[PDB]
Amino acid sequence: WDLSELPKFEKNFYVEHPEVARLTPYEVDELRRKKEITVRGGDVCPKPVFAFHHANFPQYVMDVLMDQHFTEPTPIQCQGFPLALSGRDMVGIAQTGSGKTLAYLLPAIVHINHQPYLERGDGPICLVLAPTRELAQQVQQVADDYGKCSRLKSTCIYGGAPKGPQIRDLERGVEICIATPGRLIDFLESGKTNLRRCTYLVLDEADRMLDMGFEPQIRKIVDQIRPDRQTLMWSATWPKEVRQLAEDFLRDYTQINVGNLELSANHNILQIVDVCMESEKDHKLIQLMEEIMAEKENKTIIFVETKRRCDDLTRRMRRDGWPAMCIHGDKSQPERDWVLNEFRSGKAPILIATDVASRGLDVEDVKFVINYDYPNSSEDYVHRIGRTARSTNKGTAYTFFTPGNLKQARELIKVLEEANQAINPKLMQLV
RNA sequence: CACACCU
Numbered sequence: 001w002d003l004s005e006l007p008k009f010e011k012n013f014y015v016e017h018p019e020v021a022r023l024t025p026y027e028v029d030e031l032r033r034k035k036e037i038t039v040r041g042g043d044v045c046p047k048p049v050f051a052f053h054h055a056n057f058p059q060y061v062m063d064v065l066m067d068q069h070f071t072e073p074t075p076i077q078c079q080g081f082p083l084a085l086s087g088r089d090m091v092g093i094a095q096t097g098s099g100k101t102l103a104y105l106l107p108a109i110v111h112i113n114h115q116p117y118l119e120r121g122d123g124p125i126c127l128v129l130a131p132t133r134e135l136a137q138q139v140q141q142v143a144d145d146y147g148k149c150s151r152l153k154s155t156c157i158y159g160g161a162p163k164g165p166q167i168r169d170l171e172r173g174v175e176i177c178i179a180t181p182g183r184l185i186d187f188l189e190s191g192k193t194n195l196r197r198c199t200y201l202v203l204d205e206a207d208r209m210l211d212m213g214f215e216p217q218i219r220k221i222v223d224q225i226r227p228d229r230q231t232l233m234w235s236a237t238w239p240k241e242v243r244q245l246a247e248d249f250l251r252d253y254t255q256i257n258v259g260n261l262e263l264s265a266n267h268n269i270l271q272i273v274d275v276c277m278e279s280e281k282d283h284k285l286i287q288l289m290e291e292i293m294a295e296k297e298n299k300t301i302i303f304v305e306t307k308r309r310c311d312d313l314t315r316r317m318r319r320d321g322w323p324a325m326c327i328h329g330d331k332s333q334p335e336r337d338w339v340l341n342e343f344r345s346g347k348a349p350i351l352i353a354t355d356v357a358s359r360g361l362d363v364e365d366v367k368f369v370i371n372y373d374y375p376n377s378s379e380d381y382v383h384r385i386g387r388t389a390r391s392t393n394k395g396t397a398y399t400f401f402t403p404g405n406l407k408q409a410r411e412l413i414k415v416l417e418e419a420n421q422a423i424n425p426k427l428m429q430l431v
Numbered sequence: 432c433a434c435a436c437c438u
C-alpha cells in the first residue's frame with residue numbers, strides 16, 4: 001500500500017474529562033447499565049461520557065447544541081463520542097431515532113479541525129456513505145448546521161442530479177462529503193475527486209451497505225482509502241450475517257450496543273399487528289386512515305413491497321380524494337426531493353413508499369407507520385417502524401400480516417416480545 | 432427476489 005509514501009496524520013486527540021476519569025470500573029459498568037450500553041468483551045474502549053461538555057467539542061458546536069435545546073447526550077452518544085474521538089475503528093448499534101448521526105458527525109468535526117487545511121487537489125477528510133439519496137441529503141444538512149460555524153464545507157454526492165454542481169463542490173474543496181455509492185464510484189473513476197486525505201470513513205446504515213446489492217460498491221470505494229483511516233459503522237440493526245464481512249473494512253475495532261443485544265425495535269413505538277387475508281388489506285387500510293385522519297396529528301407513512309404497488313395504491317387513494325403522495329426509485333430525483341419536502345412540511349400528510357424511505361429518514365411529527373405489505377426481513381420491519389417515535393417522541397405502527405408472510409412470523413414475534421408488546425393471538429396461532 | 436445503489 002506504499003506504507004511510507006503516505007503523509008502522516010493523527011487520530012487520537014481525545015482528552016478525558018476529570019468528571020469521567022474519576023469513575024472506577026464498577027461505577028463505569030453501572031453507568032453503562034443505566035444507559036443500557038454494552039461494550040463487546042475484550043475490545044479497547046474509553047469510559048462513556050455523560051455530559052456534552054465532556055466531549056471535547058469546540059465552543060461553536062456547544063452553542064449550536066444549546067440553541068437546539070439539546071440538554072444531554074443520548075446513550076449511543078455517551079459511549080460513541082469518546083470512542084470516535086479516541087480514533088478507534090468502531091461499530092455503533094442503537095435504536096432508531098436515538099441520535100447516531102451526531103454521534104458520528106461531531107467527532108468528525110473535531111477530527112477535521114485537527115488536520116492541516118485542504119489544499120488544491122485535496123479530496124475530503126471525512127466521507128459518509130448512505131444507502132439512499134434522500135438520507136445522504138439529510139445527513140449533509142445536519143453536518144452543515146455544525147460545520148458552518150467553523151468554515152467547514154460539505155457536499156452531497158448522489159445520482160439523479162446533474163454532475164456539474166457536485167463536481168464544482170468537490171473541486172472547490174470539501175472537508176465533509178456525504179455520498180451514495182454509485183455516483184461517488186463514478187467520480188472516483190473519472191478523477192473528479194480522490195480519497196487520499198480521507199482519514200475518517202463512516203458507513204451509516206452499515207448492515208444495509210454490506211448487503212448483496214451494496215457490498216461490492218462499498219468494497220470498490222474502501223479499497224481506495226488508506227488502511228490507517230478510522231472506520232466507523234452505525235445502524236439500528238446488526239445481524240450476525242454482516243459481522244464477519246464487516247471485518248474486511250475494520251482494523252483493531254470496538255463494537256458497542258445500546259439496548260438488547262438481539263434484534264430490537266424502539267420501545268416508544270406501539271406495535272399493532274393485524275393478521276388478515278391479502279384481499280382484506282384495501283378495506284382495512286381505509287378504515288385505519290379514516291381513524292387516523294380524524295386526529296389533529298396524523299402524519300402517516302404507508303410502506304408497500306414494490307414500486308408498482310406504490311404507484312397503484314397512490315393512484316387508488318388519490319382517486320378517492322386522499323391527500324397521498326408516493327416516493328420510490330422509479331421517480332425522477334426532482335420529484336423524489338419534492339415529495340419528501342412536501343411530507344416534511346406537512347402540506348401532504350400521507351406518504352406511500354417503498355423501502356427507499358425505510359432507513360435513516362428523520363421526519364418531524366410522523367405519528368403513524370403502516371406496513372401495508374410486511375417487509376422482506378425483520379430488520380427492515382424494525383427500520384420501517386422506526387420512522388415514527390424519533391428522539392423522545394412516541395408513535396404507532398400498524399402492520400398487515402397475511403398467511404403468505406408465515407415464514408417471517410417467528411422473528412416478528414420475537415421482536416414484539418422484546419418490546420413488551422401485546423401479541424395478536426392470530427399471529428401466535430400462525431406458529 | 433424485492434428494494435436500493437453512477438450513466
Ligand SMILES: Nc1ncnc2c1ncn2[C@@H]1O[C@H](COP(=O)(O)OP(=O)(O)O)[C@@H](O)[C@H]1O
Binds near residue numbers: 099391
Ligand atoms: N442529545 C440529543 N438530545 C435530543 N435530541 C437529539 C440528540 N441527539 C440527536 N437528537 C435528535 O434526534 C433525532 C433523531 O436523530 P438521528 O440521528 O436521525 O437518529 P438515528 O440515526 O439514531 O436513527 C434528530 O432530530 C436529532 O436532532
Ligand code: BEF
Binds near residue numbers: 359
Ligand atoms: F436509526 Be436511525 F433511524 F437512522
Ligand SMILES: [Mg+2]
Binds near residue numbers: 251252
Ligand atoms: Mg482502530
Ligand SMILES: [Mg+2]
Binds near residue numbers: 088089228
Ligand atoms: Mg482507527
Ligand SMILES: [Mg+2]
Binds near residue numbers: 260263
Ligand atoms: Mg438490539
Ligand SMILES: [Mg+2]
Binds near residue numbers: 360
Ligand atoms: Mg440514522
